[PDB]
Write a protein that binds this ligand. Structure first.
Ligand SMILES: O=C(O)/C=C/c1ccc(Cl)cc1Cl
Ligand code: NA
Ligand SMILES: [Zn+2]
Length: 258
């Protein structure tokens, strides 16, 4: 498959190879704050990242992934809407060419400059490939980025991007603490959805944080210097690698906060 974000291979084309693109629980969605309902049954969200073990950062031609050792429970997400234990496997971002676009989820139709996805899988299914075949296989923690003050916890990521400029390049990325990417508040919205890239599988419990993090202009500018293309190929800047909001259909978005 040769999907991407251009006119000829972008989100409007994906359904031809991945018909679930037009399915009943696709992501992202617009979060209407005036219709999302507070759910008092939601348990506390538990982000347990103290023993996180990062390994590598990779430009995969769509975004860049920071990968983690998920062979044991070392960085997990629990609580909230979740039952059981979800292991952190990787995180990545989606971002824009302009500061007013880049996020996948929107809030009352507002776009943010970027969106962070921390991807976790349900350990009851044994490995990630099995988990993505289950309706409760994944939990993705989504965090909005707005342009303002620099995010110190993001700078080590920014610092290494020159070493993975093109598709297929990877670099060591051990001893990175993903706790430095979180906002102060863990207030969230949650709804059942999908992967936002092919194969678009409907296996995700989305947990989208209310509070955006701030990153600096220079930090997001360095995201935009990455390339979709491989080394030696014509340069295509890696920007606007986001899917737009999809129909909510038969779903309710719940809020953890009043
Ligand atoms: O978070 C995203 O934007 C896409 C994630 C993703 C895309 C493809 C596969 Cl096979 C698995 C995952 Cl977690
Ligand atoms: Na299992
Ligand atoms: Zn993503």
């Amino acid at each position: 498959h040769h999907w991407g974000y251009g006119k000829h291979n972008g989100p409007e084309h994906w359904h031809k190879d991945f018909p679930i693109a037009k399915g009943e629980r696709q992501s992202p969605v617009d979060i209407d704050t005036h219709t999302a309902k507070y759910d008092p049954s939601l348990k506390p969200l538990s982000v347990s990242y103290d023993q996180a073990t990062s390994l590598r950062i990779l430009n995969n031609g769509h975004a860049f992934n920071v990968e983690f050792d998920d062979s044991q429970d070392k960085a997990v997400l629990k609580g909230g809407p979740l039952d059981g234990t979800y292991r952190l496997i990787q995180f990545h971002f989606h971002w824009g060419s302009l500061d007013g676009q880049g996020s996948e989820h929107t809030v009352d139709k507002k776009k943010y400059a970027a969106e962070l996805h921390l991807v976790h899988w349900n350990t009851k299914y044994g490995d990630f490939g099995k988990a993505v075949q289950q309706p409760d296989g994944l939990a993705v923690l989504g965090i909005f980025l707005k342009v303002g003050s620099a995010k110190p916890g993001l700078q080590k990521v920014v610092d290494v991007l020159d070493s993975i400029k093109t598709k297929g390049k990877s670099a060591d990325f051990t001893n990175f603490d993903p706790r430095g990417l979180l906002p102060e508040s863990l207030d969230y919205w949650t709804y059942p959805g999908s992967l936002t890239t092919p194969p678009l599988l409907e296996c995700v419990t989305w947990i989208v944080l209310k509070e955006p993090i701030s990153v600096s202009s220079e930090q997001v500018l360095k995201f935009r210097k990455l390339n979709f293309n491989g080394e030696g190929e014509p340069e295509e800047l890696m920007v606007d690698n986001w899917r737009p909001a999809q129909p909510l259909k038969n779903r309710q978005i719940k809020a953890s906060f009043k």
